[PDB]
Amino acid sequence: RWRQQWSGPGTTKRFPETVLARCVKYTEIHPEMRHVDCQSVWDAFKGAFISKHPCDITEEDYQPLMKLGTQTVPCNKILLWSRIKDLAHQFTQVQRDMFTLEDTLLGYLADDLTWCGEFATSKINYQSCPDWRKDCSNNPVSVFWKTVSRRFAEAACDVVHVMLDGSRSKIFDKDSTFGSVEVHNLQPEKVQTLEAWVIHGGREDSRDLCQDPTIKELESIISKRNIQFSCKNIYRPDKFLQ
Numbered sequence: 001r002w003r004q005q006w007s008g009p010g011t012t013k014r015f016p017e018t019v020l021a022r023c024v025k026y027t028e029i030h031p032e033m034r035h036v037d038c039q040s041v042w043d044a045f046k047g048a049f050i051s052k053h054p055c056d057i058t059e060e061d062y063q064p065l066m067k068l069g070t071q072t073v074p075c076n077k078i079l080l081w082s083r084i085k086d087l088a089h090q091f092t093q094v095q096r097d098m099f100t101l102e103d104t105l106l107g108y109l110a111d112d113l114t115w116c117g118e119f120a121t122s123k124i125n126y127q128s129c130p131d132w133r134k135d136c137s138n139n140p141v142s143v144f145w146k147t148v149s150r151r152f153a154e155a156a157c158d159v160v161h162v163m164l165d166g167s168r169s170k171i172f173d174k175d176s177t178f179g180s181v182e183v184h185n186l187q188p189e190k191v192q193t194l195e196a197w198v199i200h201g202g203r204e205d206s207r208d209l210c211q212d213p214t215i216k217e218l219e220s221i222i223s224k225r226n227i228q229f230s231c232k233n234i235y236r237p238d239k240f241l242q
Helices: 015-029 038-049 059-068 085-094 105-110 140-154 177-185 213-224
Strands: 079-082 158-165 191-199 228-234
Touching: 015 038, 015 105, 038 059, 038 105, 038 140, 059 140, 079 085, 079 177, 085 158, 105 140, 140 177, 177 213, 191 213, 213 228
Parallel strands: 079 158, 158 191, 191 228
Antiparallel strands: none
């Protein structure tokens, strides 16, 4: 017909199968979400982006999926992260009472996947999906992750932790979901402290990264939002205390 070709990779192959299997396994190992009808949430997920131009997806498109995947997690044991998902998921795996976004149903469903649809048809596009900088920044994956990260940050309370990679050029990057969505959606009425865990890395060059200019910038941001800021250098990543 008039198919749109994009500069980014297509939908992950076996995407419906993978999403349904992930939902099954999650409801298995997370009994607090056993009330979930997985076929219905997959229907909501696919209805979010099917038969819609991939560059005009909005948060409301994902609203039905957000309701079937509502998950009130203990708000005082939320672990945010940025650019160190390996170590963050290791921590939540060895200290199984704390949650990352990927430990919730929707994050576990969509983690490491790619998906988009077509405007003229109702089939999932497996050939290409929009590139964020070359095609369009608001696509099914972008809108989904922004929406879910906003709702996950808004649900946090008491002391909220964030894991950060100290080996990055920008330990705190404004152009990340944590910097562009999560820090701005922590509720001052529920959160009193954001605690950064700056994980150390780089064979040599291990000083006090809590004095890094990006950490001071994050501190001023969270302070202007009337939330206390906490920062702790982590020199070697011993989850073997845990």
